[PDB]
């Protein structure tokens, strides 16, 4: 059945896209703590 195969593709595309977002959210936080990790060194150079 194509309309049971559809509903699988879409439901699994939605699942995989929530996986992707979870990686993007991890990226956002990794970049933020890297930005703040540089602050002390950057201040030391004025």
């Amino acid at each position: 059945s194509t309309m049971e195969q559809l509903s699988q593709y879409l439901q699994e595309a939605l699942h995989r896209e929530q996986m992707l977002e979870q990686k993007l959210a991890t990226l956002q936080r990794l970049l933020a703590i890297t930005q703040e990790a540089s602050d002390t060194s950057w201040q030391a150079l004025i």
Binding site: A13, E17, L20, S38, L45
Partner: protein, 47 residues
């Protein structure tokens, strides 16, 4: 009861999440660009 009622909702939801996460990626680009600028300025201030 019909099928598409849940498919169309899923496709509509799929595209809306892609839109807000494509925006999230855009803000990531600027995040990493700001980090790039900061790392490059530390190097030039060490040269």
């Amino acid at each position: 009861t019909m099928a598409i009622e849940k498919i169309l909702t899923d496709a509509k939801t799929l595209l809306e999440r892609l839109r807000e996460h494509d925006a999230a990626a855009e803000s990531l680009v600027d995040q990493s660009a700001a980090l790039h600028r900061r790392v490059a300025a530390m190097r030039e201030a060490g040269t």
